[PDB]
């Protein structure tokens, strides 16, 4: 997971919503802080710019490498 740091990553939430943002830090619970994170729902349609977010590890399903870091 440490390798994934600073990358643009795609997390899938527990509710099916897809979040995309830079991975700044993690923790034990897999709580993630995502910089410049935006939300996509259906697939672009229904995209919103959230900004800096924490996500809770209890909600996270999976993560995948989206793009390289800024």
């Amino acid at each position: 997971l440490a390798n994934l740091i600073d990358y643009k990553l795609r997390v899938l939430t527990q509710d099916g919503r897809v979040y995309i943002g830079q991975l700044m830090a993690f923790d034990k619970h897999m709580n993630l802080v995502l910089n410049e994170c935006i939300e996509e729902r259906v697939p672009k349609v229904e995209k919103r710019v959230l900004g800096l977010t924490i996500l809770r590890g209890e909600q996270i399903l999976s993560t995948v490498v989206e793009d390289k870091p800024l």
């Binding site: 939430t13 509710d15 700044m24 830090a25 993690f26 923790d27 034990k28 619970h29 709580n31 993630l32 802080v33 910089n35 959230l50 900004g51 800096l52 977010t53 924490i54 996500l55 809770r56 209890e58 909600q59």
Partner: protein, 82 residues
């Protein structure tokens, strides 16, 4: 403690937005954040999944119930880049 917990403690005194497991959104000034993610919030504007919006003075939600928070970008500078 978690590094994100440390950030969230830095977020105190700022305006944050919270989405809970129900889906309601609470925007307002975060008074206090415990290690367990329990948060005390002020002057909250709430938007329900139906779209209805309410105002409330003081709100305190359990950590476990929070889906996610958005905090201001001021904090993004440091010291979590390390």
């Amino acid at each position: 403690n978690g590094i994100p917990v440390k950030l969230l403690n830095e977020a105190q005194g700022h305006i944050v937005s919270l989405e809970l497991t129900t889906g309601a959104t609470y925007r307002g000034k975060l008074v206090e954040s415990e290690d367990s993610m329990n948060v005390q919030l002020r002057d909250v504007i709430a938007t329900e999944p139906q779209g209805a919006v309410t105002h409330m003075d003081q709100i305190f939600v359990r950590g476990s119930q929070i889906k996610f928070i958005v905090v201001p970008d001021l904090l993004k500078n440091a010291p979590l880049f390390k």
